[PDB]
Each structure stands twice: as structure tokens, then as C-alpha cells.
Amino acid sequence: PVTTATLGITQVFWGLDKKLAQRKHFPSINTSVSYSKYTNVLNKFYDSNYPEFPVLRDRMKEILSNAEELEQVVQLVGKSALSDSDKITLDVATLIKEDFLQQNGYSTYDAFCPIWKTFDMMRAFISYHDEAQKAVANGANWSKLADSTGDVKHAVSSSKFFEPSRGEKEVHGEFEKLLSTMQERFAE
């Protein structure tokens, strides 16, 4: 009753996911049941500082929602013959959950991820997803693209370790190299 009366007045909600907490995945924030009713008010600041933040945030939300929809069928049907695009989306979402969403609060590198670092990591992850979808649409088999772009996958998974103390100009340059490396590796 306390939370169902709170939800009527609160404008944000970060409901804890029991499954994500059992997996020792922190923060165990339920992505489906959480919300923030300032995502429309805060466009006045996103479009001024980081113009692409809303579109990429919606893209990540859509990817996670699609993965959540597909995971039920995966569990109920063994998931042997997913389409290449569906496999790419589910792998990208698993990577997002493991690297972007997961955050070791006590770790020195990920103690406080600044907004610019979060935006850059979102750029990297969405760019990986778009590159994977483009590769699948090119006709090449995702089973081979996995080995071909394992280097890029490890690079985006280790972009989490970019220490924010390096400075906004320095870190944003490091990410720009990673995205540049991403496009170059797309020739595989």
C-alpha cells in the first residue's frame, strides 16, 4: 500500500528487480517497471547540451524492451533458430545489461559515471547495435560476425573502464576513437 500510494505522487520510480538482485547485478533497477516522467521536461537541457541523448535513450529502451519480449519465447522454446536480426538484438541487449547497466559502485572507475561519459557509452552501444544490424542486412552470417567483431565487442565492454578523471575532452576523444575503430572494423 505504501508504494501503490507513492506511485500516484512520485514523478520518478526506480523499482528494484528481484531477479537482477539475485544475479548480483548492481544496480538492480527494473527496466520494465521503472520510469521517469521528466524525460519530456529534460529535453530542454538535452537538446542544449547533448542533442542526441533522447533518441539514443529511446533506442536503448526499445532494444531492452525487444530483448525482454524475445526472452520469454527464448525460455519457452529453447531458442535454437532465432533470426539473425533477433540474435543480434538479444546479444546487444545482453551486452548492454552486462556493461552499460551494470555498475560496480565501489569500483574506482565506475564510482560516478558523468553524464557525458554515459552519453558516449550510449553512443558506442547503439553504434554497435546499428553496425550489427547493418552487417546482418548485408547478408553476412552473425555467427561469423561474432568472431569478426569480437575485438569491437571487447572494446565497447571495456569502455566502461574509462576513468572519468581523465577529463571530458580527453575521454570524449577516447570514445571518438572507439567509434571510429567501430566503423573501420565494419569492413569485416
Added chain:
Amino acid sequence: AEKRTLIAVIADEDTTTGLLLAGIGQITPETQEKNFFVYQEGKTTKEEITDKFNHFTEERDDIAILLINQHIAENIRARVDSFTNAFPAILEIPSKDHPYDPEKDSVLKRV
């Protein structure tokens, strides 16, 4: 599997000769055995035929498709029915003066 690239025939002498001319199998240098285990239906024994079929369909054999003439497979029909594994597949090749009958097809009987 990768090692499965081999074809085994246990048919009659004429069919075995024809398939050997086609070049189905090879003689193993280490095992001193060949996949072209020619065995007449009237010669040898039913126990020998069953043992050969078991060796070819089990014991980590490299045969992908087991070729048994309908006449010879009829005598080992119990073993053929028992061989319910997906691989290696078994076929009932017609034999001279012994045409293939749909009723004698063990695998087609599952329909």
C-alpha cells in the same frame, strides 16, 4: 560429425561390387577393415550379419549412411528396428531378384 564422412554397404555381392566401383568406402590402414563389408544373404550367418550391422551402426563408426539390401536387412529386421538413432541413416537398397518393398522399410514404418 567431421569423422562421419564415410558410406557403409552390407548388401549382396553384386550390389557391394557396384557400390565399390562407385567408390563408397575405404580400407582403414590401422583397423585393417573396409566399409565394403560384402556379405551374401545366403552365405555367412544371421548372427554375423547382426554383428557387422552393430559394428557399423555403433562403436564410434565413421559411416554416415548404412546401406543394407532389403533381402539382407529382412533377416536382421529386429536390429534394424532397434536402430532408432537418427544417425547413421539406413536404406533398404533393392537387390537382384529382390525388389524393395515399402512394408520392409524400417525407417518408413515410423510414419
Added chain:
Amino acid sequence: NREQVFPTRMTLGLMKTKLKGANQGYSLLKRKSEALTKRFRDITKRIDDAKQKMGRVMQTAAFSLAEVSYATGENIGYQVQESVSTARFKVRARQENVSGVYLSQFESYIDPEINDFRLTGLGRGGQQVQRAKEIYSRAVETLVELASLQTAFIILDEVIKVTNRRVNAIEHVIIPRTENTIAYINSELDELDREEFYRLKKVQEKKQNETAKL
């Protein structure tokens, strides 16, 4: 008939979501079984057609081999057995994805290192022996195709049996068990609500009696 889940509002929600998931999985697996059994019927038809084709091809190839043997004057069985050192015809397994199952389908392969034929040194009927070799090569190709068909048939039949077993299990065990569990949990929650109502009614009666006494 019912699970041992402790009746709570959270447990009721979890079990209702489980019932919805089980019903969705039942519909999905029933449709999958329908698609795979249509494909199974198609594969059975192709199996029958290929069986007739094999019945024809074996007869014609045996006739060709007998003609070659008659032309050569002796059976080529000894030469064929002697030339069995290496294999010229091999089958490479391919895990072709058909529908939602990775059915294994064979693909024939050949090598040039075993190009030797039994006609070498025969001295008679070389053209006939070569023609018989070509006919039996085509025959072996047809049998590899039929073996791929038959392996796909066996795999698909096994998967269809498993899927239909799961569909029937969901329809007759999981859905009845989960529905009974929902009914039991709802009844227990209603009983708890009734008990709380009685306790509050007793408190209200005591308060009203005290107010009247004042």
C-alpha cells in the same frame, strides 16, 4: 493438483503471470507443431517419391553393371575390392536450419586421390565399366540425397514428438495445476480478508459500545 506456494498477493501475481506465460507457450508450441507437421508431411511425400526413384535407379544401375560384366567376361568384384584402399565418395554433414530445428542434411563430396577404377587392368569392356561406374556414381548421389531426406525425417519426427508431448503436458498438467493454484491462492486471500474484516468489525463494535457507555 496445486503447488505448495504460500498464498500471498505477490505470489498470486507471480502465478498469474506464470499462467499467462504457460498459455502463450502452449499456443506457440501448438503452432510450431502444426508447422513442423506440415513440413513432416511434405518430407514423407518426398521420401515416398525418392523411394520410387531409388527402386528405379538400382534396377537400371544393376542392369548396367551386369552388361559391363558380360562385356568384360568376368565379374569386377575382385578388382573393386582390391581398389578399396581409398574412398572417392564421401558425405559431409551440413546442419541446415529448416523451420526452427537444426536438421542435419548430408552433402556428397568427392576426392581425386581415389580416382582409380576397377576397369584398370581388366583388358576388356573398358567403356562399359566406365559407364557402369558413372551410373553407380549417379546412384550414390541419389542415395545420399535420400539419406539426407531420411535423416531430416527422423530428426523432425523426434522434434515433433517432443513438441507435441510438451503441448499436451502444458494443456493437461501445467494449465490445470496453475489454474487450481490460482483458485486456491485467491480463496486463501479472500479468507484472510474476511478474517481482517471480522477483527475490524469487533474493534468497531467495541468502540461503539464504549462510546455508548460514555
